[PDB]
C-alpha cells in the first residue's frame, strides 16, 4: 500500500500535495534565479 495516503485523497493527501508543491516552488525559484 505505497502512496495510499495521497491516493485516498483525504485531508492528509491534500496536506501532502500542498507540501510537495510549496517546497518545490521555493526550490524552483532558488534554482531559476541561479539559472
Amino acid at each position: 500500500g505505497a502512496g495510499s495516503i495521497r491516493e485516498a485523497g483525504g485531508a492528509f493527501g491534500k496536506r501532502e500535495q500542498a507540501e510537495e508543491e510549496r517546497y518545490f516552488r521555493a526550490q524552483s525559484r532558488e534554482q531559476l534565479a541561479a539559472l
Binding site: 491534500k14 500535495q17 500542498a18 508543491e21 510549496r22 516552488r25
Partner: protein
C-alpha cells in the same frame, strides 16, 4: 357562453364511424394490459382503450400483446376492447408549443386551450448520422461564470449536470434558460435559443414553482415545459424525454437552435425499470433492464449540430443525474457519463463551504473545450483556469482565493458574456489582490453596476467584435483602475 359550445364543438366532431381492428384485454394490473388479438399491431404502436385511455404495445408475443397504459389502469377491466390507432407514438411539434406547459404526450396542462399544432413527429426517431453533422463551434451561453469560463458549452453538445440531491442542478438549468432572453429578444436570429425543460418524476408543485420563476423573468415565451410528474404513469415518465427531444428536433431541423434539459434522467431510468419489470423482462444490475444504456444513448445522441446543407440548426442537451452519497460510480451515473460530451460535477461539501454554484472545477470537463467560446472569454479564461489549477495545487494563494470568490454567483442572476469578461479581467489582472477576500462580491456588484451604467460603449464593443482588442484592453484597464481607486 352557449355559442362557444354549439358553433362547431357540436356540428364538427368527426361523427364518422370506422371498421376498427381491435383486441381484448386478457389481464390488467399495475399498468400492464395483456391483450388477446390485435394481430396486425406494430411494435411500439399506440393503441386505445375503450375508456379513452391510450397505451403503447411493447411486448409482441405469440399469444398476447403487452400494452403499457398511459394513465390509470383502474378504468381498464378484463374483456375491454383495445382499438388500433395504426400509428407509432408521436407528439405535436412546432412553434405553437412555446409558452405552453404540456404533458408527456403533448396535451396542454396549463389550462390555456389546445396547442394549435399542425405538425407531428415520432418520439423514437433515429439521431442524425455522421454526414449531416458539423463540429460544435457556436457557444451556448449559460450566464454562469464558472460554466461559461471553465466548462464552456457549445451548441450541439451534451453536457451532464451530476451531483447529489439539493446541490444546485436545477438552478444551473434554470439560470441557463433565463439567460437566453438577451438573444431571444434581439435581432440576430442565429443567436436565439429556444429552451425546453422536461420535468421527469418531479413533484407537481415544484414544476409550478419553476414555471413561476420562468414567467417572472419572462422566459416562458420561448420555453416549452414538458411535465411527467410523480403521479403520472411510468410510461409517461419514460416517454417524456423523447417527446421533449422531438419538440427540440423540430427546431434543430428547421435551422433554429434549441436547448433541452432532462431533469432528471435517473427518474426516467426508474420508470423504465418499473415498466420492464412489470412486462416480466428479466432484471439486470440493480434490477435495471439490460438496455438502460441504450435507453439514454439513443436519446442523448439526438442532440447534434447540423451542417449548412441541413439548415445549420442545433440541439443542445443538458441531462441531469442525481447520485447517492456522491457515488459517481453507480450504474446509471456511469452510463450517462460515458455517453455525454462532458460533466458538470456539483458537490455538497463545496456547496456548504460557500462555493455556490458548487461546481467542482477539478472534475468538471467540457470535451468541446475552448472550441465553443468567444475569443475574449478564451483570453481571460485560459489564464483563470491555469491560476485556479495552481491555487488548487498549493491550497499564488491570494489570487486563487480572489478567483474562487469571483466564481461565486447568486441564483437567478445570469450575467452577460461581456460583463463576465470584465469581471474575470478585473480579477485576473491583479486589481483585486488589494481587496480582502470578504468584500469581493460587493466590489463586483458595484463594479458591474457602474460599468453597465456608464460604459455601454466598451461592453457593446466587446459584444460586437467578440475579442478584447488592445484598444478596448487599455480602455477597461483605465476604467477598472479608476473604479478601484474610487472603491
Amino acid at each position: 357562453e352557449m355559442s362557444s359550445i354549439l358553433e362547431e364543438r357540436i356540428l364538427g366532431a368527426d361523427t364518422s364511424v370506422d371498421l376498427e381492428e381491435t383486441g381484448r384485454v386478457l389481464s390488467i394490473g399495475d399498468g400492464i394490459a395483456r391483450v388477446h388479438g390485435l394481430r396486425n399491431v406494430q411494435a411500439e404502436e399506440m393503441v386505445e382503450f375503450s375508456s379513452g385511455l391510450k397505451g403503447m404495445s411493447l411486448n409482441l408475443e405469440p399469444d398476447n400483446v403487452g400494452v403499457v397504459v398511459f394513465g390509470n389502469d383502474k378504468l381498464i377491466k378484463e374483456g375491454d376492447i383495445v382499438k388500433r390507432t395504426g400509428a407509432i407514438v408521436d407528439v405535436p411539434v412546432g412553434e405553437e408549443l412555446l409558452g405552453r406547459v404540456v404533458d408527456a404526450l403533448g396535451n396542454a396542462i396549463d389550462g390555456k386551450g389546445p396547442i394549435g399544432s399542425k405538425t407531428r413527429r415520432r418520439v423514437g426517431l433515429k439521431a442524425p448520422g455522421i454526414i449531416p453533422r458539423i463540429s460544435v463551434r457556436e457557444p451556448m451561453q449559460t450566464g454562469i461564470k464558472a460554466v461559461d469560463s471553465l466548462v464552456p458549452i457549445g451548441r450541439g453538445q451534451r453536457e451532464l449536470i451530476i451531483g447529489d440531491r439539493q446541490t444546485g442542478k436545477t438552478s444551473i438549468a434554470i439560470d441557463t434558460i433565463i439567460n437566453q432572453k438577451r438573444f431571444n429578444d434581439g435581432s440576430d436570429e442565429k443567436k436565439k435559443l429556444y429552451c425546453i425543460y422536461v420535468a421527469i418524476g418531479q413533484k407537481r408543485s415544484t414544476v409550478a414553482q419553476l414555471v413561476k420563476r420562468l414567467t417572472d423573468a419572462d422566459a416562458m415565451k420561448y420555453t416549452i415545459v414538458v411535465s411527467a410528474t410523480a403521479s403520472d404513469a411510468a410510461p409517461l415518465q419514460y416517454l417524456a424525454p423523447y417527446s421533449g427531444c422531438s419538440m427540440g428536433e423540430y427546431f434543430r431541423d428547421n435551422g433554429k437552435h434549441a436547448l433541452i434539459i432532462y431533469d432528471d434522467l435517473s427518474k426516467q431510468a426508474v420508470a423504465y425499470r418499473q415498466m420492464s419489470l412489470l412486462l416480466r423482462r428479466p432484471p439486470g444490475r440493480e434490477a435495471y433492464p439490460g438496455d438502460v444504456f441504450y435507453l439514454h444513448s439513443r436519446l442523448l445522441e439526438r442532440a447534434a449540430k447540423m451542417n449548412d446543407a441541413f439548415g445549420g440548426g442545433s440541439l443542445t442537451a443538458l441531462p441531469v443525474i442525481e447520485t447517492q452519497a456522491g457515488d459517481v460510480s453507480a450504474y446509471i451515473p456511469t452510463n450517462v457519463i460515458s455517453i455525454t460530451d462532458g460533466q458538470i460535477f456539483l458537490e455538497t461539501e463545496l456547496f456548504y463551504k460557500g462555493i455556490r454554484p458548487a461546481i467542482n472545477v477539478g472534475l468538471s470537463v467540457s470535451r468541446v473545450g475552448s472550441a465553443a467560446q468567444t475569443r475574449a472569454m478564451k483570453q481571460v479564461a485560459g489564464t483563470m483556469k491555469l491560476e485556479l489549477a495552481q491555487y488548487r495545487e498549493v491550497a499564488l494563494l491570494s489570487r486563487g482565493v480572489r478567483l474562487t470568490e469571483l466564481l461565486k454567483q447568486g441564483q437567478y442572476s445570469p450575467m452577460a458574456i461581456e460583463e463576465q469578461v470584465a469581471v474575470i479581467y478585473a480579477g485576473v489582472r491583479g486589481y483585486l489582490d488589494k481587496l480582502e477576500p470578504s468584500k469581493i462580491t460587493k466590489f463586483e456588484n458595484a463594479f458591474l453596476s457602474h460599468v453597465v451604467s456608464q460604459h455601454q460603449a466598451l461592453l457593446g464593443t466587446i459584444r460586437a467584435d467578440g475579442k478584447i482588442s488592445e484598444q478596448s484592453d487599455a480602455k477597461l484597464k483605465e476604467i477598472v483602475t479608476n473604479f478601484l481607486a474610487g472603491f
